[PDB]
Design a protein around this ligand. Structure first.
Ligand SMILES: [Zn+2]
Ligand SMILES: [Zn+2]
Lengths: 321, 321
């Protein structure tokens, strides 16, 4: 017997391949996926004539190029790994408590919940890799399975295993781009040796790892100079649409009574002897809204180990320092 | 009181920082490591004056640049993640059964055993990222903790979790480079539409995912053409120092009686319902040497699910096809 199928790697371009029913899909084409399931070792099963197949191996020159333009430069196990994740995360629930989406707790995915909910608050954000954008747009439309699977694929997350939210958030942002002007100017100087300016722009200006408050970010750093004197590092200019600050689990008392400038923050929970639980939290109304994967809580004060903290747009100059 | 310390991110360049005993290391410097252990939240502990500290946060312009030149472009959680792994994999054993090193079974690291043992057989291989080379040279000298920790860091492997050997092997090789000439020429053609040649070189020529035998790699692929006729894909020229072929767990009968051309291969073991066990195997003498993380076995025949397969240097032209 003989059947003919449609073969794609992107869902846009298709080629027709004629297959017999003696050999396996593996020996005839390569690693093929049909509606989620891997069928590489199976014999072309009669009734599946004229169906679309997603290929992962033995890509043609045209397929390799289109694969690169859509996903960017990825390792050759990326597709199999991405398709497997799409099928695995299909039974995951997004719940919307008062018009805010959150990922339900399933198979240690609370780190993803923190990643997604933090990404939702970032404005003027665009992904340079086309496949991420299409999935990002789908996610914003209510269909988030592609985005989750891609984030796990690019982050090299395995299904079922716990992971780091900050780690994943920074790796995802590396693939993103800002739609407006951002500027960050650091000043390194010595009273004898002179002045040096370091300028960052784009998402580079909007992200910082080391400090978790804006007062600490603007503070002056001092160490020994080449000349034997003193060197100083301090922020001079800062113009952003928003500011994300990150650090390791750092215990802080968070209070609404002081009216904090930050909009939201992530929290690592559980003792260091048994690690793997994240919580997203937003400041809305006069309260702290705690999002523990589906469930929602409210407190005015909270002593917690904060990791990532998101601030509004900065517009600052070092006031006569 | 007041103490002064040496701060590095590379072990080469050091700056002197003067620290008081009121604040934490975190608020004064940032994320600091001393002899493996994270001490960011601790108060500068008196006797640790004039000691070297490894910093992960709040890097100076000079530190950021040197960090980039040594490790390449990495996400801002890379250092903390790398230092934590160095301390974690310190109690791992390399055993040498008849002048061949293998990584002992510990915390599901059998995938690393396969990765390392396969890398050991690759000749004329050099890493473009300086930190990988220094660790690779250390590894070859008998000290492998740095290399393992780096591979886990770049592969985004977590300590204790199982992982994919092919996945890791391809991501590691992406950072490598060949010290000689390699060439791979694929020919895509149609009898009506014409001929098109696709040329690959370097490690690109020495690696292929899709087929696991050289006969299949040289075989002709056929599908429907744009013109309505037939398109063909076939390898024409192939000159390499060695050839690595990869595929998913594929059940094969491996026999020494046929005298196979391949030197070594990796095997995925265990049912798909409970995944996570790899085995490295080399053909030496008249037998198959099975390396199951420390332990060694011998058989003449073996029905197993092969993944990666390594061949000697290719020198081939399509013989009047
Ligand atoms: Zn000076
Ligand atoms: Zn044609």
């Amino acid at each position: 017997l003989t059947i003919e199928v449609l073969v794609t790697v992107d869902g846009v371009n298709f080629r027709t391949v004629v297959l017999n029913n003696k050999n396996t899909y593996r020996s005839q084409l390569g690693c093929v996926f049909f509606n989620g399931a891997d069928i590489s070792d199976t014999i072309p099963d009669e009734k599946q004539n004229g169906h679309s197949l997603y290929l992962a191996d033995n890509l043609t020159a045209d397929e390799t190029k289109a694969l690169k333009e859509l996903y960017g430069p990825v390792d050759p196990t990326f597709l199999h790994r991405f398709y497997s994740l799409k099928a695995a995360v299909h039974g995951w629930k997004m719940v919307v408590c008062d018009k805010v989406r959150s990922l339900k707790l399933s198979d240690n995915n609370c780190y993803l919940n923190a990643v997604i909910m933090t990404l939702d608050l970032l404005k003027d954000i665009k992904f340079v890799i086309p496949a991420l954008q299409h999935a990002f747009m789908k996610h914003k439309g209510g269909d988030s399975t592609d985005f989750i699977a891609l984030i796990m694929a690019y982050g090299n997350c395995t299904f079922g295993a716990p992971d780091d939210a900050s780690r994943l958030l920074h790796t995802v942002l590396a693939k993103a781009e800002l739609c407006c002007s951002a500027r960050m100017v650091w000043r390194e100087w010595c009273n004898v040796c002179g002045i040096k300016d370091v300028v960052l722009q784009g998402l580079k200006a909007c992200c910082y790892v080391g400090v978790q408050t804006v007062e600490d970010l603007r503070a002056r750093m001092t160490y020994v100079c080449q000349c034997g004197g003193e060197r100083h590092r301090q922020l001079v200019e800062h113009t952003t649409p928003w500011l994300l600050l990150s650090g390791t689990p750092n215990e802080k008392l968070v209070t609404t009574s002081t009216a904090p400038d930050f909009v939201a923050f992530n929290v690592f929970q559980g003792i260091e002897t048994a690690v793997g639980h994240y919580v997203h939290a937003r400041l809305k109304g006069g309260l702290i809204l705690k999002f523990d994967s589906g469930t929602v809580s409210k407190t005015s004060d909270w002593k917690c180990k904060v990791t990532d903290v998101l601030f509004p747009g900065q517009k600052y100059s070092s006031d006569c320092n």
